[PDB]
Symmetry: C3
Subunit: 335 residues, 3 copies
């Protein structure tokens, strides 16, 4: 009755990937919700594996390099994340998905690095308004949360400056292993790199013209044709329209409806190959109290879908009956 009967949960409160304080509170926003209770009610055993502690150096220890802000905090955090994720995914070798709540999206370099150590043939589905694939010299902002894929993609390595402390961050993805859904705010150089290297991508224009059902099918066909590969689902909450997820740092109008977001997660979950899902860029310090509740709510529905929640209902584990309790039914009485 369940594709996944257990799962692990991990918080990664990254906040040095971008300048707005508050992504560090994303994991708590989910823990304070009814997520755990709802997952248990569906028959899934979810273990809270705690939080990764990011490395947050001071300004003096971590000056700008190649325009990148907090790049040594990033490289050290990346290795610490990768070790923890690798360990969890290997203890897991019905499989046991790992649910990761961020934290800004810079955590993805580490989560995918560690995941790939455990599952080298994985594919990545990146759900985001943005490409998050800027190389350091092309980034206008120097914010690491806009660069996490660039360090992982083998075809991009001639455009990444060498730094000694980045050595352990080995590019573990081919361009052919990634597919985007939800894009609507790409930087020019991202557009160039995505098209040059043939990365599968489905922008909001494609979703409008094709419909989300065909988009999901084509994205899975592009990177996981026969469902042979483990799936790393990297979900930026800002992929969803700001009407349903306002509390995030770089909101862009015209995003996925919650329903469209649910359909992506339902289909990925149903492959039986969901290995890691991470949800990035929750920021409970942004927007009104009601904005935060809407965003928390959307996130909870999304994550539950990833774990197998069905909108069309679940059957009871045990079917209750009146006679058992010694109670008289209307039907019995009429007889």
């Amino acid at each position: 009755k369940l594709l996944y009967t257990s799962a692990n949960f991990l918080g990664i409160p990254t906040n040095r990937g971008q300048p707005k304080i508050g992504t560090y509170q994303g994991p708590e926003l989910i823990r304070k919700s009814n997520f755990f209770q709802l997952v248990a009610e569906d028959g899934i055993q979810l273990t809270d594996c705690g939080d990764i502690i990011p490395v947050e150096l001071n300004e003096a220890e971590d000056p700008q390099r190649f325009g990148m802000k907090w790049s040594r905090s990033f490289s050290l955090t990346t290795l610490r994340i990768a070790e923890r994720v690798e360990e969890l995914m290997k203890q897991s070798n019905k499989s046991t998905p790992l649910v990761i709540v961020g934290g800004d999206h810079s955590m993805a370099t580490g989560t995918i690095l560690g995941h790939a150590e455990a599952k080298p043939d994985l594919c990545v589905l990146w759900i985001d308004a943005h490409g998050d694939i800027n190389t350091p010299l092309n980034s206008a902002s120097g914010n690491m949360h806009g660069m996490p894929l660039s360090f992982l993609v083998k075809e991009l390595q001639d455009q990444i400056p060498w730094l000694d402390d980045f050595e352990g961050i080995k590019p573990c993805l081919n361009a052919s292993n990634i597919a985007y859904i939800g894009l609507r705010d790409l930087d020019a150089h991202e557009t160039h790199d995505i098209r040059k290297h043939g990365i599968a991508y489905f922008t909001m224009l494609d979703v409008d013209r094709m419909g989300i059902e065909a988009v999901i099918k084509e994205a899975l066909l592009a990177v996981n044709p026969r469902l042979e590969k483990a799936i790393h689902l990297s979900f930026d909450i800002d992929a969803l329209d700001p009407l349903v997820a306002p509390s995030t740092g770089t909101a862009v109008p015209g995003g996925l409806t919650l329903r469209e977001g649910l359909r992506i997660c339902e289909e990925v979950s149903a492959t039986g190959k969901l290995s890691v899902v991470e949800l990035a860029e929750l920021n409970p310090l942004l927007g009104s109290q009601e904005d935060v509740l809407k965003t928390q709510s959307s996130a909870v529905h999304i994550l539950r879908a990833c774990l197998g929640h069905c909108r069309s209902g679940h059957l009871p584990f045990k079917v209750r009956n009146l006679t058992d309790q010694g109670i008289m039914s209307r039907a019995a009485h009429m007889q």
Copy 2:
């Protein structure tokens, strides 16, 4: 030019079906709106038939029984509603639809009971995020608004405890006469009962995959194949997304857009078989002032659609002409 040239309007301010105070104000929220004026502007004669007074016993007279809260208030209210609705529907035997504004959804047991006395072969279209079909021993909350269909469905009667005061509540529906649209939060035992007894149901997943146009067609095909039966349309305002109907007691994200809600009502109206439409679960005491206005607005658009309002326009009853008033037109002047 009109499928329905007259209609009746009835308020049922039920509030003992669920614990949040304020559903009793639903009928006034519609009367205070421009609904009546707009319906008249479409050429429909709408008669306000007043309000049913619910029976609201005190705690001492109405203790919990089989976990149900306010079950004797419910049984007495149900019979009082059924008598009034039966009387109105028989005085009506182009037909004259009855528009009912609630009130929490527990009123439906009474409205359908009385409707079926006048029209025994009716079908029911239940538009709701929820199944409202819990039997009393399976209800986690004991709230009657989550159980109204269970008492009506013949196939369920071995799961309903006998109570003397429920005797006059005779099951008048077969499972084959009901179809749901909009479901996204079913309890496990509801899911079990719906599937076991073959009740037609179209959840938000079905709406996503099939599109609302096909869903409406399939729902009508399932319970009213050749448009031979009178239609009881039971519309829970919470079927609509909380972005358009926030002021309701059990809001669930990812609901029908207003447009999708309009399409259901337009198609049902256009069958010529709309006999009763009820709109349940408005609660003007929930949310901000603007939340209440949004919810009132959505409700008014929905109800107008049920009565035949066309978004593509209506023709004037009399076409005005310049010469008639002795006025010179530009065309006339140029000649």
Copy 3:
């Protein structure tokens, strides 16, 4: 790489077309946004051509006539607008689109009059919840913003009262040159006139049943079958759902999503025939501060789409390279 490499921008702060103060601030709402910057970032040279000064007479000089409010302010403003637009469109005879920001929708009589002087064979795509085609004796409100097309449509001229000061407002459109998208609140007499004279129209019902992709295609087929004609795109911000454009004077629920609005503008832009786009009915004095930001944001996305912005990305004008700066890449280092 660009269909349009330059464009002109003009503000028309009309506010005598309707009673709510604030449409006069629409052009500033766009100038205060990041619109200009974003358009430049796409490689388009946009020239701000300033604002037209509307003629605003006093009550004594401009009494009601045929029930019309401020009709002489309207006729004088119309001629002043038409002269300015004609001059700009002729200096422009890759073409150079003119972007016009209003201002209430009464400005359209002038913008289309002047546009047609420069391009007599134009077609009009009118994106609006409303018909804006009431003739003066049928208007319930006497607000000119609800009548701008009636003065332009040749087939309607026997229903327009003659006024000497309207003489220079020559009907320059055939009914066959106009198509509506987005309608959901037509007056009865508008409905009558649209159907009688065969004006192509796609209401929200049509958008629901056909989908926006087919609607856009059919609208262009109806008025511009082989893309031979210049396009005047008249976009009332109230065509969009009040959830995305709340700050406008006559909001109607159940409108176009931003995405649907974007698709209209993208397809019109891509014809290469976009000659004028005007955006009407922004009112920054309506709604909360956040309402105004949402409305400004929607307007900016819409206008950028009209000018060729692609949600699927743009390529860089110059591709940056590491070696050029004398920087060592990871790939280089490994070798």
